[PDB]
Write a protein that binds this ligand. Structure first.
Ligand SMILES: CCCC[C@H](NC(=O)[C@H](C)NC(=O)[C@H](CCC(=O)O)NC(=O)[C@H](Cc1ccccc1)NC[C@H](CC(C)C)NC(=O)[C@@H](NC(=O)[C@@H](N)CCCNC(N)=[NH2+])C(C)C)C(N)=O
Ligand SMILES: [Cl-]
Ligand SMILES: [Cl-]
Ligand code: NA
Lengths: 99, 99
């Protein structure tokens, strides 16, 4: 699909059996989701952006469905104000910026 | 052009006759650049990101070139970790996300 940017590029995702809304963020290296449980092992991480840093849990090899497209990758879980799909999974769905 | 996301989508911008690097950010409502001098009056804004809120200076109707494409619009100046081009100017250069 082609998403214009007049409004926030929000899509439905499916992660850990749950449907969530998330923002497609080309300015995000990583994917970060609000607090939830995910299976498997995790390790602590700090991620930063505007306003400074937050502590998250890093889960690897997590499968996710993004607007109907399946991908696998690292998912960070923590007190993010918005669910964000970052470049590590945008690539897997073949997303590009075009102008 | 068409930009894939395996690396950060960094472009050159030109503002106040100076060249700078900036990140195309579909997850940003607004354009935010590091401390610099811009003409005219400014107004206060608070913007939030992953780690909380920062105060910025809002300048309207600023001429800026982005990857060779001319835009004229609002630029926020403040303690951002990286220069970001947000949706307010990505729409002016006709950018879309595609997958
Ligand atoms: C009346 C006026 C109000 C308007 C004002 N609007 C905002 O605050 C809006 C929602 N904020 C945003 O749109 C801001 C950008 C700033 C701006 O646009 O103004 N967006 C953002 O900050 C979005 C995510 C987000 C989106 C919506 C809400 C919250 C967060 N992330 C953009 C941000 C760019 C970064 C490189 C500086 N990316 C990130 O923060 C990601 N970080 C990374 O990718 C890091 N690994 C990069 C390392 C950089 N440096 C370092 N470590 N030293 C993170 C998600 C993993 C408000 N107060 O609501
Ligand atoms: Cl990954
Ligand atoms: Cl590709
Ligand atoms: Na895992």
């Amino acid at each position: 699909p082609q998403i214009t940017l007049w409004k926030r590029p929000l899509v439905t995702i499916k992660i850990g059996g749950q449907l969530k809304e998330a923002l497609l963020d080309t300015g995000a290296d990583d994917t970060v989701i609000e607090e939830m449980s995910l299976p498997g092992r995790w390790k602590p991480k700090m991620i930063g952006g505007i306003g400074g840093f937050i502590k998250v849990r890093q889960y690897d090899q997590i499968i996710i469905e993004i607007a109907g497209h399946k991908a696998i990758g690292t998912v960070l879980v923590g007190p993010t104000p918005v669910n964000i799909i970052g470049r590590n999974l945008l690539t897997q769905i073949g997303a590009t910026l075009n102008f």
